[PDB]
Amino acid sequence: SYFGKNYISKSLSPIINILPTVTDSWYELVITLPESVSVIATGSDTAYGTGW
Amino acid sequence: NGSLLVPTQNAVYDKIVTVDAAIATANTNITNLGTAKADLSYVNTQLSADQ
């Protein structure tokens, strides 16, 4: 577990100090939820600039 | 098409980038076409001179 997400290591060899965010060594199973339940999308309107 | 989901910033940004790349490619095609492909005035003048 890492920042509220679950990452499954997929490297065939031991990995140490490799963050769960790296897609090469981790899977990051996207949390399946009841899609019928209308989960609200909190949208931070923070005027971005098309380079971020 | 049917997607009750929420679009990520990265997917939208990448699609925007490739759309802009396609638009720029079309614009450059128009640029290198007009200057080297399409012409009516001087062609008509040379045709009239030949006639």
mmCIF file of C-alpha atoms in Angstrom:
data_model
loop_
_atom_site.group_PDB
_atom_site.id
_atom_site.type_symbol
_atom_site.label_atom_id
_atom_site.label_comp_id
_atom_site.label_asym_id
_atom_site.label_seq_id
_atom_site.Cartn_x
_atom_site.Cartn_y
_atom_site.Cartn_z
ATOM 1 C CA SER A 1 0.000 0.000 0.000
ATOM 2 C CA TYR A 2 1.226 3.476 -0.922
ATOM 3 C CA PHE A 3 -0.707 6.754 -0.695
ATOM 4 C CA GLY A 4 -4.018 4.919 -0.670
ATOM 5 C CA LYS A 5 -3.272 2.725 -3.698
ATOM 6 C CA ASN A 6 -2.238 -0.923 -3.925
ATOM 7 C CA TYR A 7 0.795 -1.835 -6.042
ATOM 8 C CA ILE A 8 1.716 -5.443 -6.842
ATOM 9 C CA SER A 9 5.393 -6.006 -7.579
ATOM 10 C CA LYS A 10 5.884 -7.697 -10.950
ATOM 11 C CA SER A 11 9.685 -7.741 -11.210
ATOM 12 C CA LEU A 12 11.049 -11.280 -11.452
ATOM 13 C CA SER A 13 13.975 -10.231 -9.230
ATOM 14 C CA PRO A 14 14.051 -8.533 -5.817
ATOM 15 C CA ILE A 15 13.593 -4.763 -5.939
ATOM 16 C CA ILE A 16 14.580 -2.419 -3.111
ATOM 17 C CA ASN A 17 14.095 1.351 -2.951
ATOM 18 C CA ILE A 18 12.085 1.220 -6.178
ATOM 19 C CA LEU A 19 8.939 3.232 -5.619
ATOM 20 C CA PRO A 20 5.538 1.622 -6.289
ATOM 21 C CA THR A 21 4.871 4.322 -8.906
ATOM 22 C CA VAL A 22 7.275 2.752 -11.428
ATOM 23 C CA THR A 23 5.192 0.868 -13.992
ATOM 24 C CA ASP A 24 8.095 -1.426 -14.930
ATOM 25 C CA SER A 25 8.407 -3.101 -11.516
ATOM 26 C CA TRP A 26 4.837 -2.602 -10.232
ATOM 27 C CA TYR A 27 1.309 -3.256 -11.491
ATOM 28 C CA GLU A 28 -0.879 -0.661 -9.686
ATOM 29 C CA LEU A 29 -4.226 -2.505 -9.623
ATOM 30 C CA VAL A 30 -6.782 0.217 -10.230
ATOM 31 C CA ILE A 31 -9.305 -0.094 -7.363
ATOM 32 C CA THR A 32 -12.491 -1.637 -8.749
ATOM 33 C CA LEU A 33 -15.578 -0.196 -7.101
ATOM 34 C CA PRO A 34 -19.329 -0.403 -7.584
ATOM 35 C CA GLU A 35 -19.685 1.685 -10.747
ATOM 36 C CA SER A 36 -23.431 1.988 -10.183
ATOM 37 C CA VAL A 37 -22.704 3.956 -7.020
ATOM 38 C CA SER A 38 -22.316 7.534 -8.221
ATOM 39 C CA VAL A 39 -18.909 8.403 -6.813
ATOM 40 C CA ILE A 40 -18.562 12.175 -7.003
ATOM 41 C CA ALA A 41 -15.686 13.575 -9.036
ATOM 42 C CA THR A 42 -14.017 16.252 -6.959
ATOM 43 C CA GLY A 43 -12.749 18.698 -9.535
ATOM 44 C CA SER A 44 -10.187 21.235 -8.438
ATOM 45 C CA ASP A 45 -10.545 24.179 -10.794
ATOM 46 C CA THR A 46 -6.932 25.299 -10.750
ATOM 47 C CA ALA A 47 -6.432 27.050 -14.128
ATOM 48 C CA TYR A 48 -3.706 24.923 -15.745
ATOM 49 C CA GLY A 49 -1.515 25.980 -18.665
ATOM 50 C CA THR A 50 -1.347 23.163 -21.231
ATOM 51 C CA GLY A 51 2.233 22.196 -20.430
ATOM 52 C CA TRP A 52 1.799 20.437 -17.104
ATOM 53 C CA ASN B 1 -18.125 5.853 -26.245
ATOM 54 C CA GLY B 2 -20.012 4.550 -23.254
ATOM 55 C CA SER B 3 -17.728 5.497 -20.370
ATOM 56 C CA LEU B 4 -19.096 6.611 -17.003
ATOM 57 C CA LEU B 5 -15.503 7.349 -15.965
ATOM 58 C CA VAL B 6 -13.413 10.502 -15.450
ATOM 59 C CA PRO B 7 -10.721 11.504 -17.985
ATOM 60 C CA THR B 8 -7.169 11.887 -16.718
ATOM 61 C CA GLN B 9 -5.131 15.004 -17.413
ATOM 62 C CA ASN B 10 -2.390 12.976 -19.121
ATOM 63 C CA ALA B 11 -4.672 11.221 -21.617
ATOM 64 C CA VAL B 12 -6.371 14.487 -22.583
ATOM 65 C CA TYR B 13 -3.037 16.302 -22.863
ATOM 66 C CA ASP B 14 -1.522 13.578 -25.058
ATOM 67 C CA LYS B 15 -4.558 13.569 -27.346
ATOM 68 C CA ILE B 16 -4.404 17.367 -27.552
ATOM 69 C CA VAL B 17 -0.697 17.176 -28.404
ATOM 70 C CA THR B 18 -1.208 14.672 -31.213
ATOM 71 C CA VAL B 19 -4.215 16.619 -32.537
ATOM 72 C CA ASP B 20 -2.088 19.770 -32.661
ATOM 73 C CA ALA B 21 0.694 17.816 -34.367
ATOM 74 C CA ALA B 22 -1.770 16.655 -37.028
ATOM 75 C CA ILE B 23 -3.058 20.216 -37.463
ATOM 76 C CA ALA B 24 0.496 21.529 -37.851
ATOM 77 C CA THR B 25 1.247 18.774 -40.364
ATOM 78 C CA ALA B 26 -1.814 19.759 -42.399
ATOM 79 C CA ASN B 27 -0.815 23.427 -42.221
ATOM 80 C CA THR B 28 2.722 22.655 -43.402
ATOM 81 C CA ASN B 29 1.299 20.512 -46.206
ATOM 82 C CA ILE B 30 -0.809 23.488 -47.284
ATOM 83 C CA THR B 31 2.260 25.734 -47.059
ATOM 84 C CA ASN B 32 4.558 23.541 -49.156
ATOM 85 C CA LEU B 33 1.697 22.862 -51.573
ATOM 86 C CA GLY B 34 0.615 26.427 -52.313
ATOM 87 C CA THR B 35 4.166 27.623 -52.947
ATOM 88 C CA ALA B 36 4.998 24.687 -55.243
ATOM 89 C CA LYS B 37 1.751 23.156 -56.562
ATOM 90 C CA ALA B 38 -1.150 25.534 -57.238
ATOM 91 C CA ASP B 39 -0.947 28.525 -59.594
ATOM 92 C CA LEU B 40 -3.456 30.127 -61.962
ATOM 93 C CA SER B 41 -2.434 33.706 -62.824
ATOM 94 C CA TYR B 42 0.948 33.372 -64.524
ATOM 95 C CA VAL B 43 -0.074 30.068 -66.115
ATOM 96 C CA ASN B 44 -3.014 31.861 -67.722
ATOM 97 C CA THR B 45 -0.761 34.722 -68.842
ATOM 98 C CA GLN B 46 1.786 32.402 -70.468
ATOM 99 C CA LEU B 47 -1.041 30.469 -72.117
ATOM 100 C CA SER B 48 -2.450 33.696 -73.570
ATOM 101 C CA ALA B 49 0.997 34.743 -74.804
ATOM 102 C CA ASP B 50 1.454 31.356 -76.476
ATOM 103 C CA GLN B 51 -2.002 31.665 -78.049
#
